[PDB]
């Protein structure tokens, strides 16, 4: 039931074997011959055309890679509930400064 020399020697020999296989393969000048849900994603889009129209586009994504990246943003944006917020902050600063100037007028 070795817990000491057996493990150490086994690791050492596997190390020498891999080192020696890599050296040989790399220095070879031999020529080498040239050789979960199963569910797709479909999106419906509603837009307005020039003049007056309301066409709807149904687009199906069968690439599971595109799927993963697409959904992950929605799930994030669904939990994410901004230029508008920055404008609101500037309208808050504007109000605070006016209030401060009113305070200065009251003091003087």
């Amino acid at each position: 039931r070795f817990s000491v020399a057996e493990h150490q020697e086994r690791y050492k020999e596997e190390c020498q074997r891999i080192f020696d296989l890599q050296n040989k393969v790399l220095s070879s000048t031999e020529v080498l011959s040239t050789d979960a849900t199963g569910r797709c994603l479909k999106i419906y889009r509603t837009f307005r055309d020039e003049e007056g129209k309301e066409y709807v586009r149904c687009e199906t994504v069968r690439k599971p890679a595109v799927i993963d990246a697409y959904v992950r943003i929605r799930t994030t944006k669904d939990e994410e509930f901004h230029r508008e917020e920055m404008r609101k902050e500037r309208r808050r600063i504007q109000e605070q400064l006016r209030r401060l100037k009113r305070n200065q007028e009251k003091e003087k």
């Binding site: 000048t29 849900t37 479909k42 999106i43 419906y44 837009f47 890679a65």
Partner: protein, 144 residues
Amino acid sequence: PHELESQFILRLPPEYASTVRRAVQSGHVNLKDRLTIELHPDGRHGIVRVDRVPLASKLVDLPCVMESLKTIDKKTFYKTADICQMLVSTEKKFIWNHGITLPLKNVRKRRFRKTAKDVEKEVKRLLSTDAEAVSTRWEIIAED
């Protein structure tokens, strides 16, 4: 300022490679007139003209990373540039599977570990279309 030099590898057909090699090792400026390189605005297509004879070229991506290493004493070597592209002369087509050395052949297919979960750009385009829209309806689907 200093701009890092951009080195790539040029692969020629073997007879044209022998003429270009003889003209390079000769060392005259006669080679300058003989060998020209025209790169097309595709970015992955060209002509290499050896002795005014046009050859069709493709700039391909190499699977490994090479590095040019210069030396003055042949004991200490200084890295000068990274090479990752080759203008072979005679997208998926612009990717080279083999490496330059003989042991590295079919490296991308066999000696490269592949880990997987363009696509990101397509997802960004889809998000932009959803934004330009009004109502979006989504369902993970089944066979249909």
